Structures are given as C-alpha cells and as structure tokens.
Design a protein around this ligand. Structure first.
Ligand code: BD8
Ligand code: CA
Lengths: 324, 306
C-alpha cells in the first residue's frame, strides 16, 4: 500500500556524464559541513561510484591519502575525519578506499588488525568502538576489513559466526542483535559476513529470498522492510543480499531499473532516495551499484559483498563464493 | 530561510571548534556539556560528541559528591529524552541512554519501560525503541509472559504489527524452551483473526507462514490440527472470493495444501500457482521456483511408494 507513483516525465535514460560531474564537484556548504561525522564514508561512496563509472582519475588521490593517514589513531582505528573518534565503520571505509587505490601501506595495517581484534566480545560480537555499542553492522565491518587485509584469521571466527547466526529471525532475515527485527540493511551485513566467512549454507535462501523479493513494490522500487516507502538505496541492500544468496532473479529487473532511473536528478545529476527528492552521494552510489548488479553495460561490475568494482577484488584476490 | 541556516552553521561550527579545543586541553567540564547540548539536539548522529559527554561525566563522577553526581545523571536523562523527541531513531542517542542506565547503582527500570510504551505509541515500528525495551526487560527481569501480554494489546488496538509479531516469535520459544501443538493452535487462532480483520496486513501472513512450519509434520497431523488447517483452507477460499486481487491468501492456500497433503492436492496446487502468478506477476520467478521445488518434493513422495 505505501508506495510512490512515478510521474511519466521521470528520467528513463541513464545520465552517467551528469553523475560523474555531480560527484567530481561535490566537495566544492550546509549538508557537507553537517555530515563531517561520516566524512570517511562519504569519501568512500564518491570514489567507489566514480570508479564504477570509470572516472576515478577525476578525484584527488594524493589528498585523500594524506587525509586517511591523519585519521588513523594511536590505537590503530580510523575516524570519520580529523579530530573525530576512531570507529569500525570508518576503519572499513578507509581500508576500502586504500584498496581502491592500491595504497594499503599508507596506514599501519598491523595496528588496524589489533584495533579490530580488540573490539570482539566474549559472545563473538563486535562493538563499534570503545563505548560498546553491539550491532551486526560491526561484525560485517570487522570481517570485511580483515578480509581486505588478508587477516581474517586474527579474530575468533567461529564465535563471530555463532553471534551472527543468533541474530537470524523467524522470517529468514537478520537483526542487529539477538531478538532484533529483520531489515534489509542488516540482512546485507549478515549475508555479507556469511559470504566472507564461508557460511552461506546456514542461510535459508528460499525463505530469506522470498522476504527480500517481497520488498519490491508496485512502483518497481524496493523498501527495507514491510510497510515502508521505497528508497533507491534498497537497490543495493536488497539486491546485493539476493545476489549473495543466489536469488537475484526473484525481483522484476525492468520495474526496478525504471524506478532507479526515475530517482536521477536530470538537472543536477545524482540520485535521490525517491523520484523528485534532493540527491546525495550516498543514494548516487547505491543507485549506480544497483544498476550494475542488474547488468547495466556502461557501469563496471560490482562486488555484492564489498560494494567495490569486481576488478579491484580480483586484484587483491578476495572474492568470496556466493550461493549462485 | 536561506540566511539563518548560514548563522546556524556558524554557531555549530564555532561550538564544534570550541568543544574540540577544550577536549585537547583536557578541560573535561560542564562547559563541554553546555556546548554539546547545542549541537546534539539537531545533530544527534555526531558520535564523537556523545563520546565527549561520556568522558566529561566519567571524569566529574570522580571529583564531585554523590549528590552532585546524581543531579548530573538526572539532567542527562532529561537531555536524552528531549533529544529522542526530536529524533527518535538516532543510534547514538539510544546508546548513550543505555550506557548511562547500565552504570547507575539503582536505575528505575519501570520508568524506562513506560518511556518505551510511550515511543511505541507514537511509532510502533521503531526498532530502536523495541531493542531498548528488550534491554530494559532483561535488566529488570520482566518475564516473557508479561511481554507477551504487551504484544497482544498492540496487535489488536491498531495495525502496523510487524514489529509486535516479530517480538512474539522470540517470546513464545522462551515460554516453552519448533512449538508445542497447544501453543501453536492458539497462535494460529490469533493470527487468522488478524488476517481476516485486515487481509492486506502483510505482517500476519508472514508470521502465519512461520507457524505453518513450526510444528509436528503432515504424517503426524493430529485430528484437531488437521481439522484446523482444513478450516483455514476454506476460510482462505472465502477471502479469495471477497478479495480476488489479494495475493497473500492465494499463497497461503498453496501452503496449507502442502501442509495437509501434497499429493492429494497436486492438481489444485498447480491451478493456484497459475492464478497467483496472474495476480502477482512481479513474483513470477519466485513462484515458478517454489512450484519447481514442490514438484520435486512430490516426485520424491511418489517414489517412496513401496
Ligand atoms: C559526502 C556524502 C554525504 C551524504 C549525505 C548524508 C546521507 C548519508 C546518511 C545515510 C544514512 O545514514 N541513512 C540512514 C537511512 C536511510 C536510507 N536512505 C535514506 N536514509 C541509515 O540509517 N543508513 C544506514 C542504514 C543501514 C543500517 C544497517 C545496515 C546497513 C544499512 C546505513 O546505510 N548504514 C551503512 C552505511 C553507513 C556507514 C557509516 C555511516 O556513518 C552511515 C552509513 C552501514 O552502517 N554499514 C555497515 C554498511 C557498510 C557498507 C558496506 C558496503 C557498501 C556500503 N556500505
Ligand atoms: Ca586525479
């Protein structure tokens, strides 16, 4: 019932040139200043979408490398920005960026590993940082960070597996902690985790796949849970999950593609959460990454696990086996 | 509109500079709480400021009296509740509240449960609030059976029920530590009341699919369960007449037939797959794969024939 209706002059072609222009100029303001607390991730979203579009060269490698080095704290962890506090979320984003740039030894890898190892709890879970918030988002951040560094063996993997599986729910999905309700973003983190740790056989792919495909509304767009509005970033969370578990064909590709294209801003470039709204780099990445999973020939193929160009993951030899 | 946002920015920016400077100087004091309260109100996702607040409160706990420390904690609780009123979905705000309550000598958990009930009245699907309620329920030691009673009132008083059914799915196994048939039967009665009350409520159908899996098995159907499932089947057919665009009831008919007797209902199962695909064409690929799976299951059953 809750859905958008797409207006018939909504964009129906892919405007790649506009999107690259939009991202290339994004750093050059209100939202920008107010979102400094996520800057490392925002830089990741920008660089990744640029690279999927073959435009990474238009961004400033050298300046980003210096910014990353200055965000590594003495504990080994990385903050969102200079003077902010280290967190697993930004440690992941940083390592993703350095992987894109083949510049991993710009930071101290041994200390990153030690920072991640230190946030694992006795039950297998990960805290985001020293203040102790527990979320399966952080189990995914921890193993994805370690996989990209070749250091997955540094954590207690069986205990980490047991925790993530304790977050599996009646509907086949996953929540943030034991007993928490299923939602797409959390499902992506947990299926991504299970891919990296070689445990996809523990997912009920038919049950979960069904819950995921039921995210597609009459408009063609996807929501993140029952009875919510569609949002273009579910093009990523839902589709990547479906791909990891071998069920991507359970959504209507053409209806989704039309929804995703309608979310573009034809004037400014960028994608918004829903057609007609204000765009942002977060929704721009996931719109483009969603199109890539749907097989769009002008976009590089994207890893459903790491949300980076497959060709990058080929280079570092970390490509987890999926269900199919 | 456009000019005062520049002056909000300039204030936020100057307040932020000021906090960081104070922090570098090791000035862990009430001025920091003052400055962060201005920023966190509009911008509760600025995590590093919640961390500054904790560092201040921790430090002050050492050099203030019990009475002074208690006053700071009550002020913190008020600040948190005002922040939640503006943005009840911030991870940082809810975590700070948990951090704060977890370190008190004598917390008032009954008051925290009421805070949850109040937020859930405003948004029954706020998962942050449900997770906080779980935390509180554990800390106090509220029994599953009371939490079950909570869920029932929520399901009957209005819809937006996914989150309440989800909680029931976790509570029921705790009361009975794969459900007992008597519990299962009462649950089926509750859910089929729901989906007949509001046949477009996805949530009851999803939970009902789970219930259909959570029991004995078809070779072990009791007479009462057999009879209940047949009765549900007929009830879904009547709903199908009243709501011929309703896909949930069609899927559920197919699932009931499976639960009852896959081979005896093979023809009707196949007819229902055709109808369902026509009613829910976005799910055609899923439905074809489910039908393929069911047909293999049927081949295996036909071949177990002695
Ligand atoms: C310079 C860019 C500025 C962008 C402007 C601000 C927009 C970004 C803020 C987006 C956000 O935080 N959104 C809300 C929900 C929402 C969706 N659409 C519109 N609003 C939110 O809570 N987003 C979470 C939802 C989620 C929850 C659990 C699991 C997955 C997703 C979200 O996207 N979380 C991600 C990404 C993330 C990471 C750090 C942040 O500070 C903010 C968001 C997340 O926590 N993880 C672990 C995913 C990591 C990942 C792996 C691969 C690819 C992308 N991300
Ligand atoms: Ca360049």
């Amino acid at each position: 019932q809750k859905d958008v209706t797409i207006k018939s002059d909504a964009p129906d072609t892919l405007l790649l040139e506009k999107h690259a222009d939009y991202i290339a100029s994004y750093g050059s303001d209100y939202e920008y200043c107010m979102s400094e607390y996520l800057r490392m991730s925002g830089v990741y979203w920008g660089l990744t979408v640029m690279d999927l579009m073959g435009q990474l060269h238009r961004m400033n490698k050298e300046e980003i490398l210096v910014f990353i080095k200055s965000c590594q704290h003495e504990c080994g962890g990385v903050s969102a920005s200079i003077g902010h506090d280290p967190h697993l979320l930004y440690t992941l984003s940083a390592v993703q960026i350095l992987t894109l740039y083949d510049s991993i030894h710009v930071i101290n890898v041994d200390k990153v590993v030690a920072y991640v190892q230190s946030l694992q709890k006795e039950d297998g879970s990960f805290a985001g940082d020293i203040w102790g918030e527990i979320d399966t988002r952080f189990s995914f951040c921890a193993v994805a960070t370690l996989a990209l560094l070749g250091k997955l063996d540094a954590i207690n993997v069986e205990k980490a597996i047991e925790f993530v599986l304790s977050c599996m729910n009646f509907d086949g999905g996953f929540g943030c902690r034991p007993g928490s309700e299923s939602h797409a973003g959390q499902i992506y983190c947990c299926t991504g985790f299970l891919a990296i740790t070689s445990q996809l056989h523990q997912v009920n792919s038919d049950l979960l796949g069904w819950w995921l495909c039921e995210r597609q509304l009459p408009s063609g767009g996807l929501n993140g849970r029952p009875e919510k509005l569609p949002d273009v970033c579910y093009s990523w969370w839902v589709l990547a999950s479906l791909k990891i578990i071998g069920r991507l064909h359970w959504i209507d590709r053409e209806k989704l593609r039309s929804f995703i294209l309608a979310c573009q801003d034809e004037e400014t470039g960028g994608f918004a959460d829903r057609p007609g709204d204000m765009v942002d780099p977060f929704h721009t990445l996931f719109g483009i990454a969603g199109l890539s999973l749907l097989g769009e020939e002008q976009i590089k193929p994207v890893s459903p696990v790491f949300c980076m160009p497959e060709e990058v993951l080929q280079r570092v030899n970390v490509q987890p086996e999926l269900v199919s | 509109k456009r000019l005062e946002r520049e002056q909000k920015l300039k204030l936020y920016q100057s307040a932020t500079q000021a906090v960081f400077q104070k922090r570098q100087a090791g000035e862990l004091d009430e001025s920091v709480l003052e400055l962060t309260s201005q920023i966190l109100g509009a911008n509760p996702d600025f995590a590093t400021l919640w961390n500054c607040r904790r560092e201040v409160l921790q430090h002050l706990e050492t050099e203030k009296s019990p009475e002074e420390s208690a006053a700071l904690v009550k002020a913190e609780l008020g600040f948190l509740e005002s922040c939640l009123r503006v943005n009840p979905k911030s991870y940082g705000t809810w975590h700070h509240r948990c951090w704060l309550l977890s370190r008190l000598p004598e917390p008032n958990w009954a008051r925290e449960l009421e805070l949850c009930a109040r937020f859930l009245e405003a948004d029954e699907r706020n998962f942050h609030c449900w997770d906080y309620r779980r935390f509180v329920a554990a800390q106090a030691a509220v029994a599953p059976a009371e939490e079950l009673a909570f869920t029932d009132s929520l399901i009957t008083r209005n819809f937006s029920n996914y989150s309440s059914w989800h909680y029931r799915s976790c509570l029921l196994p705790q009361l009975h530590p794969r459900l007992p048939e008597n519990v299962l039967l009462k649950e089926l009665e509750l859910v089929q009341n729901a989906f007949f009350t509001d046949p477009n409520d996805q949530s009851a159908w999803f939970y009902h699919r789970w219930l259909l899996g959570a029991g004995s098995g078809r070779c072990e159907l009791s007479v009462e369960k057999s009879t209940v499932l047949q009765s549900e089947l007929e009830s879904c057919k009547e709903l199908q007449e009243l709501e011929p665009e309703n896909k949930w009831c069609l899927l559920t008919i197919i699932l009931l037939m499976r639960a009852l007797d896959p081979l005896l209902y093979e023809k009707e199962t196949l007819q229902y797959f055709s109808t369902l695909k026509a009613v829910d064409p976005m799910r055609a690929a899923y439905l074809d794969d489910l039908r393929s799976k069911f047909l293999l299951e049927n081949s295996v059953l036909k071949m177990e024939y002695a």
